[PDB]
């Protein structure tokens, strides 16, 4: 009775890179081959711009210089790869801004920060952008720096400065790479350089890497929510992200609102149907009208009867729907035996119940070790000694745990904002949660949809 169903370890998903080469290590492949989207010239050159107070601009130009020159990893050398220099590794020059492409924040921002007013501080930071606004053609990306003296307005109740800035500059189409002193002073340098460089390339152009072995006929959907603590009650702001590989070479990753008020994170019949309608209409527009054949709706909470009925009735019979729920905190945890020195291989899925499975999005990864090749690497070794798996509670499917598990595993590796090897959750869930935070901070965003490069 102690013998469970046999598991199968899904191998490490391959990532499409420069010249359609595949390598499961993102940074190693980027150094070796280059970005997938560099095959075409979406970014001609990464022209930057600075927005910071006059005192701390030297930090911005210093960090840009550090991006220009190669760096070596000091911490987590088990996984990271030596930086080859932005021009060498991303095959695109990184242009330092000239005098007019380099703005100065108003001194009134300091007064507002001393006053402890987050809303006015974000408004003033946005209003400082007008000088760059004329030369909107001049600067592709903008590196907004925030001095530590503004910490009092960085994060407090009912507010978040980063989300407010992102929601204020998203309709203005300019990507923004916020830089805090936190990662300006962090000891290891290759860490910050790799993260900032991949973010800069994604926000200026896009697609640093693309997941291979992706059927063009599947659209993956992830719903996630956030809470705004009202004085009387609460507001549950839920938003949905969508990923798919279209007929064109440009892999698409978008997010959108879901509309009024919600007291619970469970969508009703009409709201679920409307969101799903918007989703497959977006897919059809990106697929010249072709119907999706596989749909994956990942939700952090269980689907009620209304949600499942809305899913069933929104599509036609030809498009099978894979309604899956992701559980983050679970009691179970495993230990590999042959007992192994390193924890269980990443990607092992263990069918517990006919509808509930354990997926090991965390765990040892093979073939991505730089030093002592062949040794396994545990991404979260610093944080945890063992990997905590997630629970997939399939609410609607025809058959095959492998089909959804491999899709989730491949969706855990395409977060360009993530410096590390993978993510505990699929990019759908994490982007839906990020956009949920954004919408909760700024409710007047429900009108439009946005690409990933805006909010990553």
């Amino acid at each position: 009775l102690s013998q469970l169903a046999a598991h199968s370890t899904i191998p490490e998903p391959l990532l499409l890179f420069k010249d359609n080469r595949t390598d499961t290590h993102p940074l190693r492949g980027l150094s070796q081959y280059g970005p997938y989207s560099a095959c075409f010239n979406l970014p001609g050159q990464v022209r930057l711009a600075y927005l910071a107070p006059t005192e701390h601009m030297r930090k911005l130009d210093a960090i840009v210089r550090e991006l220009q020159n190669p760096a070596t990893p000091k911490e987590a050398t088990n996984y990271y790869v030596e930086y080859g220099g932005f021009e060498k590794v991303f095959k695109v020059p990184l242009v330092m801004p000239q005098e007019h492409l380099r703005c100065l924040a108003l001194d009134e921002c300091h007064g507002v920060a001393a006053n402890g007013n987050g809303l006015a501080l974000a408004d003033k930071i946005v209003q400082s952008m007008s000088g760059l606004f004329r030369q909107k053609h001049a600067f592709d990306v903008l590196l907004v720096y925030l001095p530590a003296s503004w910490k009092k307005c960085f994060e407090y109740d009912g507010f978040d400065l980063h989300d407010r800035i992102k929601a204020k500059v998203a309709p203005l189409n300019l990507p923004i790479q916020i830089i805090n002193d936190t990662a300006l002073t962090r000891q290891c340098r290759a860490n910050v350089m790799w993260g900032v460089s991949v973010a800069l390339y994604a926000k200026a152009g896009g697609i640093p890497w693309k997941l291979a072995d992706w059927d063009k006929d599947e659209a993956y959907i992830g719903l996630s929510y956030a809470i705004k603590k009202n004085a009387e009650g609460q507001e549950y702001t839920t938003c949905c992200s969508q990923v798919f590989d279209p007929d064109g070479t440009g892999f698409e990753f978008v997010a959108y609102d879901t509309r009024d008020r919600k007291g619970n994170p469970y969508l009703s019949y009409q709201e679920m149907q409307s969101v799903l309608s918007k989703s497959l209409h977006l897919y059809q527009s990106s697929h010249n009208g072709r119907m999706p054949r596989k749909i994956f709706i990942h939700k952090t909470t269980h689907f009620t009867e209304d949600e499942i009925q809305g899913a069933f009735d929104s599509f036609s019979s030809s498009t099978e729907i894979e309604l899956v729920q992701i559980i983050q905190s679970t009691n179970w945890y495993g230990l590999k035996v042959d007992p192994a020195s390193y924890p269980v291989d990443r990607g092992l899925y263990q069918p517990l119940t006919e509808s509930e499975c354990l997926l090991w999005t965390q765990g040892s990864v093979m073939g991505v070790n730089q030093q002592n090749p062949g040794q396994p690497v545990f991404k979260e070794a610093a944080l945890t000694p063992l990997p905590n798996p997630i629970m997939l509670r399939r609410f609607s499917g025809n058959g095959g745990w492998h089909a959804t598990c491999s899709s989730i595993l491949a969706l855990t590796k395409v977060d360009w904002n993530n410096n590390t090897l993978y993510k505990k959750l699929p990019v759908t869930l994490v982007y839906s949660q990020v956009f949920a935070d954004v919408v909760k901070q700024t409710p007047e965003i429900v009108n439009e949809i946005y690409d990933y490069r805006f909010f990553m």
Binding site: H7, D313, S314, S316, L335, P339, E354, L386, S396
Partner: protein, 576 residues
């Protein structure tokens, strides 16, 4: 009339209820609405003369919609969503070619884009299970009719104007269920959709409908007036002495946005002695599910198709353990049936009241409410006097897993019982944090031989480790090894969850040792965690995890005793 009253009214007398659904239900089935249909024609018209690529502009874009509407207004056409526009654009595009008009209207509303939704699969169920007999739908779509074919597997008798006399005969001979389209199927020559055709009514259908009205009461949904012929037919139809015994409820999605024609017709009907009421019941799809929710004794065969989510999908079986194998922390509890004690109270009791009685009396027994008690009767007599106790009997839990899954009170009770059993005869202390239970090595008895293996588990490079002590930089915080033990219901099985933790003697001062808890747990890798879990299994069970079926009973010296049996080996499964 409030909405809750409408549901009660539609439930008290649901056997005599005509339905009236015109162009409003088709919106939610994935069928383009008339407003969307006007844009499709404008798109074709603009792209045709002004030679533009059809692929280049999508009609639901705002810019392209504005440009096309501006072009239409340039040639003097009607301005915006105004009467005599839909028919105008039809007669403009198709220049009086009713065959081509019919073919286009068939293609736009064809039976391939239609996906039935719960509101649709509910009206057809009402038709089949024979509550509503007459459904006059002013829609030319093949859905509600497709819904009936899907839900019951039979053929539905639809009556287009192509026959137009069958409905008058069919209603009279009571060969229900009837679906008379006042404007007929698109599969036939006459469609009656343009404004000039919308001023007259077919003589025989006028009759069909009147017959239906005397016999039943009308519920009209998804209808916003704007039609003169249907409005005058309804006005005449009230003229009849017993027009709707069951009253007519016009369900609009919003009373505020309802056209004044509907309101004045309702006032006229009320002035003519009928009890016609206008109610706002939100969307038709939401309303149909509520009406279906209030339906009693719905057949299972049709309800398996009405609500496909109600049946449980994805019952995908798991394979065998054939052919590296992860070793989880789950100990399977193979106990299937247990015995408990029940006390009957002369007055109703609350689970909170029993919890506070537990807190005050502190008996040597367990109790929960559902009052099921595990232990000795005299303890319950201490808790409850003879006056409040009526009788004390026995309870049998034939299926423990189903019982704990059904009621969370049973889950908590069985978890507490198994925890008490496991720590009954052992020196390991039993504490609780939040709603979880912790078995922690005691401070005084830390030098026991039964802990020595645990001492080996934490040891560094094979030397002797430490099990209990004081934090390196804390004033009074004391720390020990511990295991969080929980009950997990998985499918049809129960398992015991063990997780190694670092217990802190002060409950509220755990965070001050966080770094220490981190520092002690930095290097508890797979081998070390394997060793600690094996040591904890040995401590909690007394037998190594090979082929063991150790059985533990709680309160063995009590009349009501629970005897569980948990396999000493944690869950494992070799890879395929």
């Amino acid at each position: 009339l409030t909405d809750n009253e409408f549901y009660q009214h539609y439930l008290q007398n649901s056997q005599h209820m005509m339905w009236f659904l015109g162009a409003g239900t088709s919106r939610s089935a994935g069928l383009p609405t008339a407003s969307d249909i006007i844009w499709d024609l404008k798109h074709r018209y603009y792209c045709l003369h002004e030679n533009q690529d059809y692929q280049k502009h999508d009609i639901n874009n705002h810019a392209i919609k504005s440009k096309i509407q501006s072009y239409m207004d340039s040639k003097g056409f009607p301005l915006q969503w105004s009467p005599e526009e839909y028919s105008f654009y039809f007669e403009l595009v198709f220049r009086d070619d009713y065959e081509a008009q019919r073919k286009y209207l068939l293609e736009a509303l064809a039976s391939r884009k239609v996906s039935l939704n719960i509101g649709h699969r509910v009206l057809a169920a009402l038709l089949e299970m024979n509550q509503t007999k007459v459904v006059f739908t002013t829609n030319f779509d093949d859905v509600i009719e497709t819904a009936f074919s899907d839900i019951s597997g039979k053929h539905l008798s639809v009556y287009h104007l192509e026959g137009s006399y069958a409905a008058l005969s069919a209603l009279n001979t009571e060969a229900f269920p009837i679906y008379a389209k006042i404007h007929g199927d698109f599969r036939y020559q006459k469609i009656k959709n343009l404004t000039p055709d919308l001023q007259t009514n077919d003589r025989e259908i006028h009759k069909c409908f009147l017959a239906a009205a005397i016999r039943f009461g009308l519920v009209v949904s998804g209808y916003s007036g704007r039609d003169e012929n249907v409005m005058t037919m309804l006005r005449a139809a009230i003229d009849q002495n017993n027009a709707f015994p069951h009253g007519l409820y016009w369900t609009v999605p919003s009373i505020s946005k309802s056209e004044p024609a509907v309101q004045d017709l309702i006032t006229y009907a009320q002035g003519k002695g009928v009890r016609a009421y206008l109610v706002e019941t939100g969307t038709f799809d939401e309303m149909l599910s509520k009406i279906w929710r209030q339906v009693k004794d719905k057949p299972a065969a049709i309800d398996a198709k009405v609500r496909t989510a109600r049946v449980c999908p994805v019952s995908i079986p798991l394979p065998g353990p054939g052919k590296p194998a992860l070793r989880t922390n789950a100990l399977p509890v193979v106990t299937q049936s247990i015995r408990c004690g029940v006390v009957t109270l002369a007055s109703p009791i609350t689970f909170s009241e029993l919890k506070e009685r537990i807190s005050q009396k502190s008996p040597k027994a367990l109790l929960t409410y559902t009052v099921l008690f595990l232990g000795g009767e005299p303890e319950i007599r201490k808790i409850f006097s003879n006056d409040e106790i009526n009788s004390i009997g026995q309870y049998y839990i034939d299926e423990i897993a189903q019982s704990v899954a059904a009621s969370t009170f049973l889950k908590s009770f069985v978890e507490e019982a198994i925890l008490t059993a496991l720590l009954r005869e052992k020196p390991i202390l039993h504490r609780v944090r939040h709603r979880t239970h912790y078995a922690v090595i005691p401070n005084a008895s830390a030098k026991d031989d039964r802990f020595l293996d645990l001492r080996k588990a934490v040891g560094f490079k094979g030397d002797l480790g430490y099990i209990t002590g004081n934090v390196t930089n804390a004033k009074e915080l004391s720390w020990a090894e511990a295991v969080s033990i929980r009950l997990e219901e998985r499918g049809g099985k129960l398992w015991i969850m063990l997780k190694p933790e670092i217990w802190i003697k002060p409950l509220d001062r755990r965070e001050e040792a966080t770094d220490f808890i981190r520092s002690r747990r930095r290097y508890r890798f797979n081998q070390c965690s394997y060793q600690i879990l094996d040591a904890w299994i040995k401590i909690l069970f007394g037998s190594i995890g090979g082929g063991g079926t150790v059985n533990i009973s709680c309160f063995p010296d009590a009349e009501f005793k629970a005897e569980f049996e948990i396999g000493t080996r944690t869950a494992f499964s070799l890879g395929v």
